[PDB]
């Protein structure tokens, strides 16, 4: 594990080792590693609160120091390529890069980078640390994946979260289903597309997605009606009350309250939305350990 | 104390204890506390040099580590509420939030946050750390507040500094007076409005304010004449030369040289403007201690 | 050395002492100094990747802590002058300022700053840490400067790098030559202006410059042709193949690949472009040591 770029690059063995290490860091069963003397740069070319702040928390707790990089004050405005930016940070003594970039598969331009890269998101491609922390949360809830009924609702084709989660849940033997507006069906993902109300009473995990407005074109954005989306594709009171006693609600965040989820359900008893954000720190510690060990 | 949001929330006893702790940190009479292992996020949704950099100096000197948050690169652009931002930073393991936000009373939306909040400014509402460092500076100058004659000149109704200082000085038994253009009189603050030249010879403390151009409407901004404002409401040579031997000049900064104050008076003998910024570090150390103990 | 503002302020003795200290830090011959307990602010009012990130790497490796300052979130929008910003950071307990600013000779407004200032670039004026790391790289390559043939190609009159390097190379007894489009000839620098192809076979060092598009006026930017610039002023395959066995290629970065340099030459055997970026960390450690000693 030289890099962490895509869930398609991980075996189920590597997924279990990362999840179990993260759980043992969190429980105190395993003491945190010490990487005092090592440096990390966080390169966020798209916006982030959780992924950037939780990577920073993980890095500082493992004794790394950060090199500040804000895109808009960098020599990117002078015409510097992503490769030159990464190779520059290597040359000045960085031991690790964490990169979120708007280009799908940006990491294919970074073959000649000799320090580990953690992909914090490539456009609508992969979000492996979101997927791993989602899997960690499910594993802590139930202790197993095989036969789990998972419904992923919302903007599927524009979601790096849906893509990473589909591949890894399927490989772990979960039953993945999608609910989507017709416009946002992803043909590349072979799982059934269903009505929420046909399956809500027999699902174990409902994963809600934010609508990726900033990834959409003009026609989609001009015809968007929030109230109509909520009625057809959102978790409301009636749908929440049909969840089995054991079932949980997940969302990679941020939430648009009243759109994909009724506001007062965000911190309802079956929600693990804020739990996911806590777990992300421990999972990112496990990723850092695997890359720098 | 659990939070520091408003001077209306503090007793004069709490004000004295904060001022005295800050002075003892500054003098070396009291050793700095050690909060190694704790994390703070600085959330500045309005611009800042002093409040943000001095909070950062105070945090680092007490052994805290910071989680970087720039508003414009955060998931706020994806539609995340202030509450969700704060609860997210709590969930990932922040022990303290320092928040400046343009909404008056923003902190009333943060009742369900379980970690301490220091208000670095809520629009035109409160600026409690400015008020406390102003009070610390006055206390170090004179050793008492009762019967002090304080003139606060400039944009009163748009000033969180004037509002916080009015409440706390009045509670400590100071005589508070205002000089304002008619447009910027604050009706909510019961203190006399006076002409500078009627009281300048008998004041102990002149506090100058910056004009809050960024908080004004079109009509105010289109009619503004800097030279006319300076003649009527500014500290010039003639007004400075009428100050008593013991009197001091204060300004929360930044200064607009030639508007509320003649340029060469910013670092004149009776100015405590740069002294206030030094004292701000020690007062913010005292606040952090109270919030994290 | 109280400040580092201009190469015109340094003796050749001071240049040798800085270069040799930087080389001994890099080789491990000399242990890094420990400035734990000291604070630095990095004030980048123009964009930077190397100069800002390498100063930060140098600062953290010497045990300094940074006070975050981003121009666009500072009280500069409230009308604060550069002097007031610097004097504020002094007052709050900063021990060192690193400043990049668009105004040529900005530092002449900072006479009343009482802490050391390192100039990370003043408009088209001076870039002393670039020049010193360029000199360090040449010194490690050859062990001497006297009689060295150095060709500096590109936008000369808009380059703080060309200005700093001209003065210091000439003082060390190197033979400095320029290649420039007619528009970008600098009259203030008395060195021959030559065609690349007339001297390429006899030069020891080719230093390429980026075109300073952001420092240009309308007429220059509207008539720019990248293709034509590359043919006349760029390092291509034919020019690279004419270099002496011992000759090196330098560039302060970032590179515009295909303009001043053919893409596949950036990491060719004779290139020291990424070596320069590594050396900059050690040179900036030596500068910080000299200023805080
Ligand atoms: O799912 C979303 O809507 C955004 C999604 N979520 C995150 O990773 C959280 P954040 O943007 O705060 O780091 C992402 O793909 O970036
Ligand atoms: O009143 C002013 O001029 C600004 C005033 N002062 C400050 O706190 C200083 P700064 O904006 O640099 O943190 C404020 O209310 O933010
Ligand atoms: O030569 C250039 O193009 C810019 C030149 N280069 C640098 O110093 C490197 P950076 O801008 O990444 O700090 C400068 O003058 O800043």
């Amino acid at each position: 594990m030289n890099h962490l770029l895509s869930m398609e690059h991980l075996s189920t063995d590597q997924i279990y080792k990362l999840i179990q290490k993260a759980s043992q860091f969190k429980s105190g069963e395993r003491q945190l590693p010490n990487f005092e003397g090592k440096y990390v740069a966080n390169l966020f070319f798209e916006n982030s609160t959780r992924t950037k702040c939780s990577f920073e928390m993980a890095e500082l707790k493992l004794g790394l120091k950060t090199i500040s990089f804000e895109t808009s004050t960098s020599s990117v405005s002078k015409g510097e390529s992503l490769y030159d930016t990464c190779k520059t940070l290597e040359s000045i003594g960085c031991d690790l890069l964490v990169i979120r970039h708007p280009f799908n598969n940006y990491y294919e331009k970074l073959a000649n980078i000799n320090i580990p890269i953690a992909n914090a998101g490539d456009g609508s491609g992969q979000h492996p640390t979101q997927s791993l922390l989602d899997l960690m949360t499910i594993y802590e809830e139930y202790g197993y994946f095989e036969g789990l009924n998972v419904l992923i609702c919302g903007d599927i084709k524009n979601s790096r979260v849906a893509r990473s989660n589909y591949h890894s849940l399927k490989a772990l033997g979960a039953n993945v289903m999608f609910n989507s507006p017709n416009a946002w069906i992803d043909d590349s993902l072979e799982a059934p597309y269903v009505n929420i109300d046909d399956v809500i009473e027999t699902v174990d995990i409902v994963m809600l997605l934010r609508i990726q407005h900033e990834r959409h074109g003009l026609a989609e954005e001009t015809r968007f009606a929030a109230d109509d989306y909520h009625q057809k594709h959102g978790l409301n009171e009636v749908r929440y009350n049909k969840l089995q006693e054991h079932a949980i609600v997940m969302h990679p965040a941020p939430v648009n309250r009243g759109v994909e989820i009724q506001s007062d359900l965000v911190e309802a008893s079956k929600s693990r939305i804020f739990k996911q954000m806590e777990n992300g720190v421990y999972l990112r510690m496990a990723v850092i350990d695997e890359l720098l060990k």
Side-chain angles (χ1 to χ4, degrees), chain A:
Chain A
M1 210 178 293
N2 288 23
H3 303 99
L4 179 66
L5 302 178
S6 176
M7 294 304 291
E8 302 207 315
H9 299 167
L10 292 191
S11 71
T12 64
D13 277 356
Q14 289 171 304
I15 288 172
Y16 279 111
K17 169 176 67 176
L18 287 168
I19 283 174
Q20 288 170 352
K21 170 169 288 180
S23 290
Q24 294 177 333
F25 286 157
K26 175 186 174 176
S27 79
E29 187 177 7
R30 180 193 286 255
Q31 81 190 23
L32 298 197
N34 188 346
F35 290 119
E36 249 141 45
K38 288 192 191 304
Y39 295 83
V40 55
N42 302 301
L43 276 46
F44 276 74
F45 295 90
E46 304 183 318
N47 287 358
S48 178
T49 293
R50 273 137 293 270
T51 308
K52 175 173 136 79
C53 297
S54 75
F55 258 108
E56 204 185 331
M57 180 67 78
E59 293 158 0
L60 294 178
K61 283 190 150 164
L62 297 197
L64 290 173
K65 296 181 153 83
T66 63
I67 300 295
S68 262
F69 190 94
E70 283 277 46
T71 299
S72 77
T73 63
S74 79
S75 283
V76 167
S77 64
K78 295 185 179 184
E80 198 165 19
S81 71
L82 183 58
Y83 171 72
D84 285 321
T85 299
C86 297
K87 191 62 164 180
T88 286
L89 294 170
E90 180 187 307
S91 301
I92 75 168
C94 288
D95 300 295
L96 178 67
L97 308 177
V98 182
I99 304 173
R100 177 173 281 191
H101 192 278
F103 284 36
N104 289 39
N105 299 120
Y106 70 78
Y107 46 81
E108 277 156 18
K109 283 176 283 177
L110 303 179
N112 195 54
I113 301 302
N114 300 315
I115 51 165
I117 296 168
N119 179 21
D122 63 300
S124 61
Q126 291 283 323
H127 197 343
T129 65
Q130 187 67 48
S131 185
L132 284 165
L133 82 74
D134 294 355
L135 295 173
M136 176 196 180
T137 305
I138 289 163
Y139 190 65
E140 283 195 342
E141 200 68 26
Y142 304 117
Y144 72 84
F145 296 107
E146 289 87 324
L148 261 304
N149 291 330
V150 182
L151 173 66
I152 305 176
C153 311
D155 182 359
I156 304 307
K157 82 186 282 179
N158 298 108
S159 187
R160 50 180 173 220
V161 177
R163 193 177 326 286
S164 290
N165 276 337
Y166 161 81
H167 188 273
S168 66
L169 282 167
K170 185 182 183 212
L172 290 163
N175 304 302
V176 179
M177 295 160 274
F178 292 120
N179 178 257
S180 190
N182 281 133
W184 301 330
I185 290 166
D186 197 324
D187 298 308
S188 73
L189 310 185
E190 301 179 55
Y193 287 77
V194 301
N195 297 322
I196 298 186
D197 294 338
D198 289 335
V199 307
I200 193 58
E201 299 174 41
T202 60
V203 172
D204 300 305
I205 299 146
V206 189
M207 191 173 314
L208 303 166
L209 303 179
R210 183 183 65 88
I211 301 170
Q212 304 292 299
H213 291 293
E214 76 277 6
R215 306 190 185 281
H216 295 171
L218 185 58
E220 288 162 293
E221 293 301 290
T222 59
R223 85 180 170 253
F224 179 61
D227 164 39
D228 181 74
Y229 176 90
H230 182 72
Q231 280 309 83
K232 285 172 186 157
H233 303 294
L235 189 67
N236 58 15
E237 189 78 5
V238 172
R239 282 167 185 153
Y240 180 90
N241 288 338
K242 286 175 171 164
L243 287 172
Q244 292 177 96
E245 188 182 310
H246 72 265
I248 63 173
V249 178
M250 297 176 75
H251 191 312
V255 309
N256 303 148
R257 289 165 175 270
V259 180
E260 63 275 17
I261 187 173
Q262 186 177 298
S263 193
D264 59 9
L265 299 187
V266 172
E267 291 183 82
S269 56
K270 293 177 194 188
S271 179
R272 299 286 183 276
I273 294 171
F274 282 116
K275 183 55 57 180
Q276 283 172 262
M277 299 189 209
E278 177 187 2
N279 289 345
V281 174
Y282 296 107
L283 184 279
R284 289 168 177 123
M285 285 177 172
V287 168
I288 292 165
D289 193 47
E290 282 312 307
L291 294 178
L292 293 183
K293 242 160 35 155

